[PDB]
Design a protein around this ligand. Sequence first.
Ligand SMILES: Nc1ncnc2c1ncn2[C@@H]1O[C@H](COP(=O)(O)OP(=O)(O)O)[C@@H](O)[C@H]1O
Ligand SMILES: Nc1ncnc2c1ncn2[C@@H]1O[C@H](COP(=O)(O)OP(=O)(O)O)[C@@H](O)[C@H]1O
Ligand SMILES: Nc1ncnc2c1ncn2[C@@H]1O[C@H](COP(=O)(O)OP(=O)(O)O)[C@@H](O)[C@H]1O
Lengths: 686, 289
Amino acid sequence: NLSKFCIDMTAMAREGKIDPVIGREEEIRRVIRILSRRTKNNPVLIGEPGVGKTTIVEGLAQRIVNADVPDNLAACKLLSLDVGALVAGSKYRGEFEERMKGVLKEIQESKETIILFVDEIHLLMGLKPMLARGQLHCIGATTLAEYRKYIEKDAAFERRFQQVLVKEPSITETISILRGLKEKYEVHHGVNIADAAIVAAANLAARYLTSRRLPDSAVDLIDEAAAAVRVARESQPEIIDSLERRLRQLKIEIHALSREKDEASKARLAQAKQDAQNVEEELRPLREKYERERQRGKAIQEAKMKLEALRVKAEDASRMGDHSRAADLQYYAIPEQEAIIKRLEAEKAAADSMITDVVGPDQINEIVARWTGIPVTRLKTSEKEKLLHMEQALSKIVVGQKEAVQSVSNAIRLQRSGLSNPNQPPSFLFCGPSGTGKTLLTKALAEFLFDDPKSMIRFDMSEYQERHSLSRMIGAPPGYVGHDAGGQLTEALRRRPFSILLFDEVEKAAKEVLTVLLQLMDDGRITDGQGRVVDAKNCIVVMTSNLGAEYLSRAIDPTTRELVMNTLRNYFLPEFLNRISSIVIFNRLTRREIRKIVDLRIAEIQKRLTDNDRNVTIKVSDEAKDKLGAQGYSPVYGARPLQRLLEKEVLNRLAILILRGQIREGEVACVELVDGKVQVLPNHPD
Amino acid sequence: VVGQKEAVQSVSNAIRLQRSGLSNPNQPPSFLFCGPSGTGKTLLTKALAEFLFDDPKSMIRFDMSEYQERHSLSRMIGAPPGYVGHDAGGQLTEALRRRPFSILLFDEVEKAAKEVLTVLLQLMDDGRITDGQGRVVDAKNCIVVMTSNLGAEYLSRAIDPTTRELVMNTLRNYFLPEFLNRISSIVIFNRLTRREIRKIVDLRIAEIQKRLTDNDRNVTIKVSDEAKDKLGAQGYSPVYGARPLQRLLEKEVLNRLAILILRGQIREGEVACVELVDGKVQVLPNHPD
Ligand SMILES: Nc1ncnc2c1ncn2[C@@H]1O[C@H](COP(=O)(O)OP(=O)(O)O)[C@@H](O)[C@H]1O
Ligand SMILES: Nc1ncnc2c1ncn2[C@@H]1O[C@H](COP(=O)(O)OP(=O)(O)O)[C@@H](O)[C@H]1O
Ligand SMILES: Nc1ncnc2c1ncn2[C@@H]1O[C@H](COP(=O)(O)OP(=O)(O)O)[C@@H](O)[C@H]1O
C-alpha cells in the first residue's frame, strides 16, 4: 500500500495532532464552497511561503471531523501527498511516474471519498491526474509566481481549479495567531511564553525578518526562543554555578593546607573551612529552592500534557457517540486533572535572576539579533524614543536640508501616533537639484526605520517612459509580454511589504505609470496586470525630481516656493499633487554645508582606518578643506563629485604613503593645499 | 458639504427627477458648478460619488487645463489609424466604455478648447459621443459635472439673487447659449461665511478624532472657541477658499499633538486641549516631560 507518501490529515485531526487554526474563516468557506461545486471543484491556494496555506487545509480537516461541513464532505478522508519525499526521493528514472501512478490508483480503488491535498503543486508540473471524472478531489497550494510560471502554462489542467488568494496577515492578525497558539507551544517545549514576547515577535518579524512572511516568521521566532529557554531552564543558574565552584576550590585548598606545618597556614586553613561553610550556607538554600521549583514546573507541564490527552479522548468519545467514556473524562478525569494544575500553579507563583523558564521580550530581541546581526542594544530602544529625536538621527547623515528632515520626521510621527489615514502610506515628493540629498535622505530613512539599506527598493522612472512599460511595473494578463516576470512593483509589495519604494526622476514616468502611483498614494493598494489587487498599507513612497533646480540659487526662501511648485503643477495633475503627504523642496548646498559634507566623508575614511589595524589619523587644513569643497561642488551635479575627488587627490596618495611607511602608526596624515592643489604629505622620507 | 444648501438641493432634485422617470432618458444629468475656489465644487462631486456608488473611484477626473488647444481633442476621444494617439485612444471614450456608471468631472471647463466643449455638448445633449474613428460610444448612464470659477468676482461673503445674472452673464460669453441651455442645472457656489468656515474645522477634527478612535488611542480632541476662531480666520482665503485649512491644522495642531502623544504628555483617556496661547494656536501638554 502506497501509504508511504501520504498522511491522513482527517485522522490527525481526531488525534489532536493539528495545532489550532485562528481566523481564516472566509478562506475555509471558499474552499468548502469550491469543493461542493460540480463545475470546477478543486481549490488551489495561492500565497507567499508561510502565510498559512497549509493550516487552512488543516482547518478543513478539523471541520470534516466536527461535522461542520456540508453532507457531501462529511465522510471524506483528506490526504496530504508528500510531494517533497516523492520528487526528491527519486531520480530521472521512471520512479517518479511509477510512484505517483501507484498513489493515484490507490485513491482510485478504495471506496472512501478522498480529497487529495498537494502542497507545492507546481513541483508536479515539472504528472497527469486527469481523474476528473469525479474520482478525486484535489486541493493545491503554490505561490503566485510559480502558479504563473508553471501552473498557468497548462490551461486545460488549470481551468479545473479555482484560485483562492491567501493574503499575508496583518501584525494585529499575527498576534491573534500567536496568542491562539500560545498554550500549544507552552506545553510542547515545557516553558512559559509572555504576551509581550508575542507582541515583540510579531512586530519585529515584520520589521526586521523581511525574508520570510508572517506569521511563519513570528512563529519560527517564538519557537526558537522557547527552545533557547528549554535548555536554560535545564541548566543551573549562574550563581549556583559560581558558588559550587568556589566551594570545590576551597575543599581543594583545605586538603592542601592541612599538610603544611607552619603558623600562617593553620590560621588560614581554619579560615578556609569557614569560607567553605559560608559558601555552603548560601548555596544549600538556593540549590534546594531551584530543584524544589524545577521539579514542580515539570510536574505542571506533564499535568498539562495529560489534561490535553484527556481532552482528545473526550472529544473523540463525544464524536463517536460513546457517552459512557465521554462522561468519565468530561465530568471526572478532566476536572480532577484541571484541579491538579490549578493547585500546582497557584503554589508556583506563591513560592517565589533564577530558574529562567519564560520567553520574554529580551529572549525575542536576542534571538533576532543573532539572526539579523543587529546589536541587541538597537532593538531594545522603543520606537517612540527614536521618533522623538528623528531629526537628530537623520541630520547626522543629511546636511543642509533641515526643512526636508523636519517634513519626513513629522509625517512619520503622524502615522505612528495614529493621526494619519491608516489606509494611505506616507508619500513624499523630493524636489531639488541633483546631489543635494534627495536619494541620501531616503537611504538614511531606510537605515533609521529598518536598520538596513536593503529595506528600500529603487525604481528608475527613466525605464518606464512609454505606455508599453506598465506591464513591467505591474505584470500582464496570461499570454502577454511579461506575464511570468510579473511586475516590479507588485512583486516587490508581496515579498517586501515593509519597504521604502523610491521612484527616481518621477517626472519622466509615463502617465499610465503615474496613475499607478496615485492609486498607491490614495488607496494604499494597487491592481496588478491580471486585475488582482495587491496590498500596500505598510510601505513608504518616496519620489524624487529635479524640476525646481532652475529657481534655486545658493542661499530656505519662501517666494521661490511656488515657482518650483508651479513648475510641478503642469507636469503633474493637481489630484496627483494633492494626494502626496508632503511636497518637500531641497535647496542648493552652501559653501559651509559643502565643507561639513567633506568632514563627514573623512570621518568615514577615518572609521575604516580605525576599523582596520591602522592608527593613522587624518587631519585636514582649513584651506585644503576649502579647495576640496570648491572643487567638489557643481551647480549641475551637486555634491556627487565629492566622493571621487577625495579618492583621487587624497586617498590614492594616502594609500601609497601608508604602505611605503612614510606615514606610520600613531602619526597624522596631514592633507594640505600645496601650490594650489590638495595633497597629503609624508612624515618620513623614503 | 457646508454652506452650499442651494447647490445640494439642485443636485438632489436633478437626481430625483431621473430615478422617478421625469427627465429625458437619453440625456445624462449635467451640472456646471460655478463659484470661488475652495467652496465645495469638487467636494460635492466626491460626496455625490460616495453617496451614489459608495466609492470615490466611481468619479473620473478630467482637468481641462490639459485640453486647451485644438490639438488636444484626440487625447479626449482618440484618433483615426496612423495618427497621433490612435492606440492610447481617448481619455473620455475609453472611460465611458469601461466605467459606464461613472461621474465625469471636468475641472475648470472655461479653459477647454471650443472643439472639446463641442464634445461635452454632444455628451450633454444626445447621451452619446463619437470617438476619433467615427465610432459612437454610449453614455446614457453617466453623470456630468463641470466646475468653473468665472463668478467669484461678484460674490462677496454673505445666497443673493441680484448677483445671479452678473455671474451668469459672465458665463454667456465664455459659453454659447446652446451650451448653457443643454445643462440640467447651472449651480452657483457663494463664499463661505465665518460660521460656515468654523463647522468645516469641526468636521476635520471629527475626522482626526475618528482615526484616533480607529487606532488604539483614547485621546479626545477639544478645541476652545477662540482657538477655533483663529483656525477659521487663518484658514479662509478670498483666493483659495477653505483649501488651506487641512494643512493649517496639520502644521499648528497635528504636528505637536503627535509629539506629545508619543512623549506621553497626553495619555490615554485624557483630552488634547487645543488653545490660543499668545495669539497662536497650540495644543498643550497634560503632564511635564
Ligand atoms: N491561521 C493560523 N492559525 C494558527 N497558526 C497558523 C495560522 N496560519 C499560519 N500558522 C502557522 O504558521 C506556520 C506556517 O504556516 P503554513 O500554513 O505552513 O504556511 P504555508 O503552508 O502557506 O507555507 C505554521 O507553523 C502554522 O502553525
Ligand atoms: N545634503 C547632503 N548631505 C550629505 N551628503 C550629500 C548631501 N547631498 C549630496 N550628498 C552626497 O552626494 C551623493 C549623492 O547625493 P544624492 O542625495 O543621491 O543626490 P540627489 O539629490 O540627486 O538624490 C551622496 O552619496 C552624498 O554622499
Ligand atoms: N463647503 C465646504 N464644506 C466642507 N469643506 C469644504 C467646503 N469647501 C471647501 N472645503 C474643503 O476644501 C477642500 C477643497 O475644496 P474643493 O471643493 O475642492 O474646492 P473647489 O470649489 O475649488 O472645487 C476640500 O477638501 C474640503 O476639505
